[PDB]
């Protein structure tokens, strides 16, 4: 799949316009794995994750569910 998917219906990451946002980014967008179903990758920026939240997510073993799937996971 990769860094340049359309990760969700409102995805705003584009290989033709992307620039760094998070302090950990250089040339590629930060991504996080959503554990819904078979699993899929989303761009952290498209989820509106703050840098602090993203770093905490990356440092732990808790599963993440993206904005489209978290309501289903908590039901």
């Amino acid at each position: 799949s990769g860094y340049w998917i359309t990760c969700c219906p409102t995805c705003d990451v584009d290989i033709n316009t992307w620039v760094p946002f998070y302090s950990t980014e250089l040339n590629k967008p930060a991504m996080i794995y959503c554990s819904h179903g078979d699993g899929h990758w989303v761009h952290a920026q498209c989820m509106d994750l703050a840098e602090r939240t993203l770093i905490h997510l990356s440092a732990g073993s808790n599963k993440y569910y993206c904005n489209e799937h978290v309501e289903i996971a908590r039901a």
Binding site: T24, P29, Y33
Partner: peptide
């Protein structure tokens, strides 16, 4: 959670 591009430079 698994992530990409979250390592401190």
């Amino acid at each position: 959670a698994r992530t990409a591009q979250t390592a401190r430079k």
